[PDB]
């Protein structure tokens with residue numbers, strides 16, 4: 001029987017972390033140690049500061065005997081919100097943060113940093129608007145105020161899954177813009193939104 | 201023998217707003233106590249206001265038009281939403297005449313009445329919304345624009361539901377009424393940092 005614990009904790013990372021700007025997300029690390037106890041973790045940029053102040057996790061159940069067995073792993077909930085204005089470069093391949101995690105057991109053994117990747121995307125990547133019920137108008141090239149109100153309400157009614165803080169605007173010819181809270185957009189062409197009342 | 205025509209009181213300030221139903225009353229009296237009928241015209245010529253209507257309830261009945269209880273003729277209508285408004289507001293009106301007669305056939309002279317009409321923004325005056333706090337005064341977010349619109353709407357249930365409230369980058373609010381006239385609420389009454 002081995003006199004001392006010389007083996008560091010083992011960490012399982014989520015494989016496909018995807019976050020949308022302005023929306024709360026969460027993911028879990030799973031950690032075990034041959035001793036059954038994990039003391040704490042470190043999120044870093046390969047040993048350097050994490051540099052992501054919006055990322056957080058609970059230290060609940062840290063450094064408790066039996067908190068990290070094979071049958072009952074330590075489950076660390078990481079969560080936060082990618083800032084609304086977080087820059088997305090021209091190549092969306094680049095809209096991600098590669099970071100590292102490691103963990104200590106209660107015997108001074110620390111694991112070697114392993115990577116996880118937080119991919120972040122514009123809100124319109126998450127949302128796909130359904131077409132509204134058609135609004136019938138007097139002039140296709142010049143909607144009235146009530147007709148624009150109606151169009152907005154129709155687009156809203158057809159899409160309850162879309163954020164309430166998204167703003168729906170309507171042009172003179174019934175073209176619909178949905179601007180999500182992160183200012184990314186979806187467009188609905190007028191021919192899918194309005195029809196001439198007299199012709200119909 | 202009745203030889204004297206009825207007398208007619210008209211409202212002094214008939215003011216109608218485009219697309220919105222108005223109502224007013226004529227009050228008519230005759231010495232006999234009875235008024236037979238009235239006629240609305242353009243100084244005797246056709247009235248030419250097909251959107252105007254009046255009630256003929258209680259016409260030509262004894263005692264329908266006494267000094268104490270005059271004949272009260274309800275007039276109502278809706279000036280067309282797209283009725284053109286002259287640059288000179290003194291011409292934004294219809295000048296018409298009413299005459300009335302008793303059962304003896306004594307007819308009054310043509311009495312003038314004027315229906316003034318105005319854009320819907322001449323009626324509506326938006327109330328202050330609760331202030332919306334924003335991150336950047338010169339560049340509102342979609343969420344903040346939504347909040348601004350919501351607040352303006354909540355403060356103004358008297359403004360037509362069909363009116364459209366828009367919000368610019370700096371929180372300036374535009375209210376566009378059904379007849380396409382507008383009101384503006386300056387940013388300073390709407391947003392704060």
Ligand SMILES: CC(=O)N[C@H]1[C@H]([C@H](O)[C@H](O)CO)O[C@@](O[C@@H]2[C@@H](O)[C@H](O)O[C@H](CO)[C@@H]2O)(C(=O)O)C[C@@H]1O
Pocket residue numbers: 051087089093094095096097098099
């Ligand atoms: C939005 C953006 O530019 N994202 C980058 C990201 C950032 O540069 C950084 O992580 C935030 O401080 O960095 C990515 O690249 C890393 C390299 O900078 C590092 O030298 O090597 C890493 C190797 O795993 C990694 O490639 C990232 O975090 O994936 C690239 C990403 O587009």
Ligand SMILES: [Ca+2]
Pocket residue numbers: 005006007008009033034035105107109
């Ligand atoms: Ca160990």
Ligand SMILES: [Ca+2]
Pocket residue numbers: 123124125126127128129185186
């Ligand atoms: Ca989309």
Ligand SMILES: [Ca+2]
Pocket residue numbers: 202203204205206230231232302304306
């Ligand atoms: Ca008389």
Ligand SMILES: [Ca+2]
Pocket residue numbers: 263264265269270
């Ligand atoms: Ca009476």
Ligand SMILES: [Ca+2]
Pocket residue numbers: 320321322323324325326382383
């Ligand atoms: Ca006004």
Ligand SMILES: [Ca+2]
Pocket residue numbers: 321322323324
């Ligand atoms: Ca006024």
Ligand SMILES: [Ca+2]
Pocket residue numbers: 152168349365
């Ligand atoms: Ca709206």
